[PDB]
Amino acid sequence: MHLTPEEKSAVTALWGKVNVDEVGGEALGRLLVVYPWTQRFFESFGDLSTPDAVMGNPKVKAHGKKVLGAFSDGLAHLDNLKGTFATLSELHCDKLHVDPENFRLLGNVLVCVLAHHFGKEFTPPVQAAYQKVVAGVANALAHKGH
Amino acid sequence: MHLTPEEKSAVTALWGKVNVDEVGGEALGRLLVVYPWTQRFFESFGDLSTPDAVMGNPKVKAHGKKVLGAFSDGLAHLDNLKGTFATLSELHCDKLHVDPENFRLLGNVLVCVLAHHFGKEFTPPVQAAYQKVVAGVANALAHKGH
Amino acid sequence: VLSPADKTNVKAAWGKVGAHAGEYGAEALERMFLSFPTTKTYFPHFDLSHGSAQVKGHGKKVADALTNAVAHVDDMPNALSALSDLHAHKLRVDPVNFKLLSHCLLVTLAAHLPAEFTPAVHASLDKFLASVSTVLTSKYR
Amino acid sequence: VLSPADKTNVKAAWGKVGAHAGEYGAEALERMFLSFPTTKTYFPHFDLSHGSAQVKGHGKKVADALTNAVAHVDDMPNALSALSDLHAHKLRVDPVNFKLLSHCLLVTLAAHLPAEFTPAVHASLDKFLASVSTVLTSKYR
Ligand code: HEM
Numbered sequence: 004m005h006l007t008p009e010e011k012s013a014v015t016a017l018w019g020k021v022n023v024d025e026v027g028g029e030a031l032g033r034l035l036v037v038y039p040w041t042q043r044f045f046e047s048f049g050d051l052s053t054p055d056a057v058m059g060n061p062k063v064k065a066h067g068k069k070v071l072g073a074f075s076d077g078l079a080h081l082d083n084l085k086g087t088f089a090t091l092s093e094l095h096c097d098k099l100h101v102d103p104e105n106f107r108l109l110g111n112v113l114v115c116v117l118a119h120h121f122g123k124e125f126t127p128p129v130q131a132a133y134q135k136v137v138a139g140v141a142n143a144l145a146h147k148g149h
Numbered sequence: 150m151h152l153t154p155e156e157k158s159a160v161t162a163l164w165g166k167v168n169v170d171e172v173g174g175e176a177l178g179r180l181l182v183v184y185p186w187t188q189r190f191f192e193s194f195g196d197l198s199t200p201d202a203v204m205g206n207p208k209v210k211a212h213g214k215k216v217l218g219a220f221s222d223g224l225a226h227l228d229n230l231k232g233t234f235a236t237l238s239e240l241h242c243d244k245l246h247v248d249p250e251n252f253r254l255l256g257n258v259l260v261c262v263l264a265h266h267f268g269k270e271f272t273p274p275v276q277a278a279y280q281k282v283v284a285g286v287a288n289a290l291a292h293k294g295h
Numbered sequence: 296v297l298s299p300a301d302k303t304n305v306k307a308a309w310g311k312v313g314a315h316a317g318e319y320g321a322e323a324l325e326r327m328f329l330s331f332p333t334t335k336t337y338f339p340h341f342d343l344s345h346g347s348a349q350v351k352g353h354g355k356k357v358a359d360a361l362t363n364a365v366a367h368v369d370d371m372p373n374a375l376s377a378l379s380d381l382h383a384h385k386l387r388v389d390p391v392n393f394k395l396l397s398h399c400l401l402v403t404l405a406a407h408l409p410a411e412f413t414p415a416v417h418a419s420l421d422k423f424l425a426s427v428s429t430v431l432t433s434k435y436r
Numbered sequence: 437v438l439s440p441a442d443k444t445n446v447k448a449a450w451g452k453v454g455a456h457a458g459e460y461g462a463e464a465l466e467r468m469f470l471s472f473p474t475t476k477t478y479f480p481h482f483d484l485s486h487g488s489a490q491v492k493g494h495g496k497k498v499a500d501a502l503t504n505a506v507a508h509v510d511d512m513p514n515a516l517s518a519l520s521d522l523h524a525h526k527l528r529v530d531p532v533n534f535k536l537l538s539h540c541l542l543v544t545l546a547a548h549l550p551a552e553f554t555p556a557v558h559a560s561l562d563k564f565l566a567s568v569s570t571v572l573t574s575k576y577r
């Protein structure tokens with residue numbers, strides 16, 4: 004990335020305090036609620052008729068954990084997101100048909116979830132580093148699209 | 150910049166037929182007319198009150214030629230746009246305070262200008278090559294942004 | 296909002312399209328597929344090969360919709376309601392893609408109506424596609 | 437369009453902001469400057485350093501306008517006519533930037549209103565900022 008040692012340390016340090024289980028479920032659910040059109044990919048999950056129905060849907064929470072899991076692992080290859088997400092990039096394009104703009108929406112949702120959770124701790128400079136990360140991830144994931 | 154050899158030949162072949170003076174004036178003028186907010190940088194250019202006042206303004210025409218001139222040079226260094234555009238990138242940021250979004254708007258306008266001029270010759274695939282190029286140039290111009 | 300001038304411009308330029316609307320619609324799609332490959336994610340079920348009948352068929356449908364919007368330039372929200380519903384509820388195309396298609400439609404018109412594609416007209420057509428896009432996205436949330 | 441639930445949600449949330457709107461205005465700007473440095477191009481005349489009085493003051497102004505908007509949630513276009521004018525004819529901020537400030541505002545509210553920043557409230561506020569953005573860029577062309 005174009006992350007500063009200081010930017011890398013801030014990312015890394017906050018992440019260490021994250022419950023991926025909880026943040027993953029919340030991030031994905033918020034996505035489905037704020038940007039309802041993203042539900043187009045999760046018809047099989049069930050009832051996403053209400054915020055409550057989305058936030059409570061176990062399938063949402065479980066997919067949320069899977070996605071953040073994968074994200075979490077990419078934070079260890081911050082200097083080669085491209086290579087880390089290559090296979091996932093193909094899958095998303097060729098099998099899932101997910102428009103890369105979704106990656107960007109989630110990224111922003113993720114940042115709102117972190118601010119939500121960390122309050123004070125999530126400072127302007129920490130947000131700035133995360134914004135670089137989420138953009139980086141979105142790009143990596145979109146890289147293999149053709 | 151994922152310019153395949155055939156994409157590069159295509160850009161170069163067409164670029165051979167362009168009257169940079171002419172296209173330069175047309176592209177800048179059209180920018181000022183389609184996205185009037187962009188006029189904010191040229192209050193010293195005089196009368197930009199109507200399409201004819203813009204399109205025929207001797208200052209707009211001369212500036213257009215200047216812009217497309219730098220662009221043309223960029224086309225001979227498709228390999229090193231960032232390097233090519235570095236001092237200009239700095240100037241646009243630090244001295245002119247030009248939001249980089251301006252660079253993307255101009256690129257789109259230029260594509261419409263090339264379509265306007267070449268008609269049928271500006272095929273879907275030629276457009277796709279130029280889309281990559283204007284993006285690469287806007288990116289190069291924004292690179293020194295801070 | 297579209298001004299009287301805008302409306303005149305659009306009726307005029309679209310007037311020239313005439314019977315080629317269909318072909319220009321198909322061409323705009325193709326340009327879009329080639330330039331903004333991400334848009335392809337919405338047509339996994341289509342044959343996107345050059346001269347695809349699916350693309351031809353779709354190009355016509357889009358062109359008809361635009362022609363209908365021009366015909367009802369003073370009541371677009373109502374003339375496009377049905378299509379607004381479809382995109383919001385079924386298709387659920389991410390809003391950013393409207394700008395991409397819009398752009399490819401402008402390139403197509405430019406490539407075909409050199410005499411009419413004046414700066415003034417270009418500005419009007421851009422405002423118009425923006426308004427159509429806004430209508431089609433209005434019921435998204 | 438803002439539903440009645442939306443308007444309720446917004447009014448509730450903003451209600452909680454209270455005497456801190458100005459500080460949150462300043463915080464969202466600071467967050468904007470750092471995360472999206474292209475936004476800085478519009479404030480060459482400001483001292484963008486942390487805790488700058490120019491930034492604080494401007495933060496107050498923005499916050500106040502939002503307040504006014506919430507208050508006239510039913511008549512935004514009218515409530516913000518002056519501001520839409522200013523931005524369209526004087527400031528001429530590119531429309532892409534509105535989405536950036538909007539995002540930094542959500543982040544700021546989330547960071548400060550934990551209990552209140554529920555998924556439904558999040559959805560409402562986003563829509564709200566979106567509408568406000570629409571209003572502010574409606575007379576651009
Ligand atoms: C941070 C960005 C993302 C990451 C790291 C990511 C990662 C993953 C992973 C690891 C899987 C597991 C699939 C497998 O291995 O077979 C998956 C599946 C999937 N993802 Fe993504 N994802 C991301 C964003 C998104 C977004 C934003 C959407 C749509 C809103 C999406 C839609 C899906 C769907 C529909 C599946 C298939 C799940 C199933 O088989 O039911 N992903 N993703």
Ligand code: HEM
Nearest residue numbers: 187190191215216217219220237245247251252255286290
């Ligand atoms: C392809 C993109 C562009 C290129 C290659 C380019 C190139 C140039 C060059 C070569 C100059 C003269 C440098 C100097 O004065 O030392 C210049 C100046 C300038 N450019 Fe850019 N430019 C581009 C896009 C833009 C856009 C889109 C805008 C605003 C909408 C803009 C705003 C300006 C302004 C305001 C000046 C100074 C004019 C003056 O002399 O008062 N440029 N540009």
Ligand code: HEM
Nearest residue numbers: 334337338356357360361378386388392393396427428431
């Ligand atoms: C202003 C621009 C647009 C117009 C006028 C338009 C209009 C239409 C129309 C008339 C149809 C066919 C509905 C029917 O079956 O009767 C349609 C379908 C569709 N559109 Fe839109 N649309 C626009 C933008 C978009 C964009 C930007 C995308 C995605 C990149 C898109 C994706 C689709 C898809 C996937 C379908 C279904 C096609 C099929 O399965 O046959 N549309 N649109």
Ligand code: HEM
Nearest residue numbers: 475478479494497498501502527529533534537568569572
């Ligand atoms: C949520 C949307 C926004 C609102 C409610 C808003 C509100 C305002 C207000 C209340 C003022 C002060 C008017 C006065 O001085 O009397 C102002 C000025 C200004 N705004 Fe907007 N603004 C918004 C978005 C933006 C964005 C996104 C930018 C640029 C990134 C921007 C750039 C400016 C600038 C440069 C000034 C003048 C600052 C000065 O010279 O004092 N605004 N805005």
